[PDB]
Write a protein that binds this ligand. Structure first.
Ligand SMILES: [Mg+2]
Ligand SMILES: [Mg+2]
Ligand SMILES: [Mg+2]
Ligand SMILES: [Mg+2]
Ligand SMILES: [Mg+2]
Ligand SMILES: [Mg+2]
Ligand SMILES: [Mg+2]
Lengths: 116, 50, 178, 136, 79
RNA sequence: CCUCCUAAAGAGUAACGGAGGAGCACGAAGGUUGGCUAAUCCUGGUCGGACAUCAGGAGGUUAGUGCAAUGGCAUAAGCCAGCUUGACUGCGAGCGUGACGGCGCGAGCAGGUGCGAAAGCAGGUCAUAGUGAUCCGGUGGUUCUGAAUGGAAGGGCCAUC
RNA sequence: CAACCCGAUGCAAACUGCGAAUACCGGAGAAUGUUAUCACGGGAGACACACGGCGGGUGCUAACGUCCGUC
RNA sequence: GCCUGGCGGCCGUAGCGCGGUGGUCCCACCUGACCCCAUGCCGAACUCAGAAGUGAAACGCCGUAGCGCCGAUGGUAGUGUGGGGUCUCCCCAUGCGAGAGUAGGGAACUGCCAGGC
């Protein structure tokens, strides 16, 4: 499955980051949406999460999952994850090739304040 | 054996050198590939390898 | 997308009613022609193939993919590596533009043809066929050429089964036979 | 006349039997010969027993052999000091213990068998006993 | 004949069974070759060249069994 | 010298016990980053033949590890490609293993590197064989010594044959 | 005639999808033990062991045989 | 609370097979592709810009026991200590007590965030 190969294609980093035990910024992509949540070291609880399926964000959006969309998200991710205190983390591209809408929201969260 | 021994001298005037081997036959060209000699305290090219 | 349009056009509906397909998706879609042209020998010259490749390219505009040997286990030869092929699957536009190159001016440009064997069933409308010889279709001043040629041609349709494969592909005047 | 066509290893160690077989009750024919004793079949015996066994039931009926040699067992020549590598595999033994159902008759009266095995197990070293078939 | 020869010690085995004092970096489990006879985990890992279960920061030893189809896994909890 | 068994479920162990291997290979077959995943069979397809190549299905470490055997490997240690030289230098908490000489594992520190967007990884190869103490000398470096003083020969120290 | 496969049946020191007793390592605690324990130093002798019980290789599950482990 | 997605916890009583079912919330497939990026050929995958279409496939859920899988109780095997019979094997007291097989169980369970009703 296209989704299957994807997962295993990042299971490594998604373990090495675990090995280190550092709060990571997980990003999930989809044909129509963009997701971003900051899970804790334990990987159990999530500290913050800003996505396109959220009315607030999507409201002032031309089209969800449009790079520009997958950018404002990352910033909101940082905005939130900062007021919460969570500064400096580890980015988990999670299968997707860090290059487009992911090479955004990531650096759109980098410049936003998040350190990594 | 056949795998002849080889010495990698520092490109820098320094006399420090490295040591390793190589198949004189198969690969004709002499090995060049940088390294770090304590003296200059800096990385640099290393030549000479038959 | 010439022939392509025909699909979504008169085709489909026909196949639709053919077995009242539950959805406009349960409609077996033509999925990429494949081609291949077995190199053969190669070792002998390892030259005619670079040509045979250019010949494979003659038809499908896409650049040929010189297929390398595999298992190596070959009374023939094969040393794991070594050259021995040129497949080149067919994609959308070129998939139908080519499906507008034959079944019209290639298959018809016969050599005898008294009925194309409608026997290539499998379990996915998977239909493959060998041409036995470069039909001399729009190559390049096709006269000097090289000794014979031939190749393979698979359809690999999304047909749920050859119990439908036959149906589709027929929506277009597919040679075949009674 | 009966041995493993092939063996990953030329010589089996030695070890020792530890009582209680596994192939107890009959599961093929309808009679058979049981253990009642401990020991090993020289394999050259299983045939000496099988042959005589057959020759009685004649042709009629089906015979079975739930035992097999498979175990090497070497022998060192006469004049030869100790410690010169293990000897050479001279014969092939078949480790059996109390319970192991040696053979198994089927197509024949419980008469032309009880006095066929009794005739058979008389070539064998390990004592024996006749067996019926057991329902359950 | 033509048979004899044989390697030597190469000890290899657990040298830090169950919760131990676990020094700043004891051995724990040598058993070379072993990448999976015992796996690296927790406040200990390393898994040196010869797959020697390292054992980082000092402390009790765990010895578990998790995901990837059972798998041993050696980790060390602090005392 | 290495592998398995004997070796009695920690280590360790004998025989002229049962079996095999090593005296190497590699500037990539090392490092990193991105990606990939086999054997086998079934059906269909020009020349394609039991078995080259193409399609689909089944299957799931039965493949593949540079070379023995054992353990291990999908997060692959298997396979492909880009950029590369960490096959760096000085050290090293703390350990394992040895009668000893000695061998092995090692996080982390300092200086400098390569790859990655980054966390990060890299002090050679999936690991375990692939080796020779000492002496006597050979080569290069160094202002350590230099038999009245300055030099030099010789000696020391580091690299190395 | 017979490969794979299904069912039923055995065998394995160098088979294991199972798996003890127990030995071993560590932690806690009472009692008993003339610190039995550890380290450093003065002095040694000894490196031909034999039989018996248990687990084994070798031999013929021969030997007051032979070679290991253990009491 | 029900449904979906993301990250996990446990890793087969969690898996597979079979039958059914769900859609502009979500998810997919899906449309377009000069481009960012990509094919040792291919927009298949990777990637971008997104309509129109469909739950077919995939995925999720529901049921079903055909197969995996879990699995007692009893007995059996072995074994530490003490004793005994004894030609290479057993037996008794005692503590421990399998493996397989049988009864049976079984179509996972759960935490955190988000979105829809
Ligand atoms: Mg041991
Ligand atoms: Mg190796
Ligand atoms: Mg033991
Ligand atoms: Mg002596
Ligand atoms: Mg002695
Ligand atoms: Mg002795
Ligand atoms: Mg004696």
């Amino acid at each position: 499955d296209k989704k299957s190969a994807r997962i295993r294609r990042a299971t490594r980093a998604r373990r090495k980051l675990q090995e280190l035990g550092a709060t990571r910024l997980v990003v999930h992509r989809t044909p129509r949406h963009i997701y971003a949540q900051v899970i804790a070291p334990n990987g159990s609880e999530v500290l913050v999460a800003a996505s396109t399926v959220e009315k607030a964000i999507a409201e002032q959006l031309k089209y969800t999952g449009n790079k520009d969309a997958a950018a404002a998200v990352g910033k909101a991710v940082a905005e939130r994850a900062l007021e919460k205190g969570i500064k400096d983390v580890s980015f988990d591209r999670s299968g997707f090739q860090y290059h487009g809408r992911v090479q955004a929201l990531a650096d759109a969260a980098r410049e936003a304040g998040l350190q990594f | 054996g056949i795998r002849e021994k080889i010495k990698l001298v520092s490109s820098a005037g320094t006399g420090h050198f490295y040591t390793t081997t190589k198949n004189k036959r198969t690969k004709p060209e002499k090995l060049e590939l940088k390294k770090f000699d304590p003296v200059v305290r800096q990385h640099v090219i290393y030549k000479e390898a038959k | 997308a010439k022939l392509h349009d025909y699909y979504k056009d008169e085709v489909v509906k026909k196949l639709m009613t053919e077995f009242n397909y539950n959805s406009v998706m349960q409609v077996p879609r033509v999925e990429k022609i494949t081609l291949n042209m077995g190199v053969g020998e190669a070792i002998a010259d390892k030259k005619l193939l670079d040509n045979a490749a250019a010949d494979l390219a003659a038809i499908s505009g896409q650049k040929p993919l010189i297929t390398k040997a595999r298992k190596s286990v070959a009374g023939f030869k094969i040393r794991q590596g070594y050259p021995i092929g040129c497949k080149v699957t067919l994609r959308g536009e070129r998939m139908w533009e080519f499906f507008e190159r034959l079944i019209t001016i290639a298959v018809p440009r016969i050599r005898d043809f008294r009925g194309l064997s409608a026997k290539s069933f499998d379990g996915r409308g998977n239909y493959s066929m060998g041409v036995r010889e470069q039909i001399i279709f729009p190559e390049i001043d096709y006269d000097k050429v090289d000794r014979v040629r031939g190749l393979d041609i698979t359809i690999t349709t999304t047909a749920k089964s050859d119990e439908e494969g036959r149906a589709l592909l027929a929506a277009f005047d597919f040679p075949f036979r009674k | 006349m009966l041995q493993p066509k092939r063996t990953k290893f030329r010589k089996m160690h030695k070890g020792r039997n530890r009582g209680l077989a596994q192939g107890t009750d009959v599961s093929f024919g309808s009679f058979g010969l049981k253990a009642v004793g401990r020991g090993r079949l020289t394999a050259r015996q299983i045939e000496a027993a099988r042959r005589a066994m057959t020759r009685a039931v004649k042709r009629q009926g089906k015979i079975w052999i739930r035992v097999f040699p498979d175990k090497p067992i070497t022998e060192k020549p006469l004049a030869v000091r100790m410690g010169k590598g293990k000897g050479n595999v001279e014969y092939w033994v078949a480790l059996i213990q109390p319970g192991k159902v040696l053979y198994e008759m089927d197509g024949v009266p419980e008469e032309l068998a009880r006095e066929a095995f009794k005739l058979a197990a008389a070539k064998l070293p390990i004592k024996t006993t006749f067996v019926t078939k057991t329902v359950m | 004949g033509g048979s004899t020869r044989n390697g030597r010690d190469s000890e290899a085995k657990r040298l830090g069974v169950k919760r131990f004092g676990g020094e700043s970096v004891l051995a724990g489990s040598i058993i070379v070759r072993q990448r999976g006879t015992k796996f690296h985990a927790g406040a200990n890992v390393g898994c040196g060249r010869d797959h020697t279960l390292f054992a980082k920061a000092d402390g009790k030893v765990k010895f578990e069994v998790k995901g990837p189809k059972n798998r041993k896994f050696i980790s060390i909890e602090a005392e």
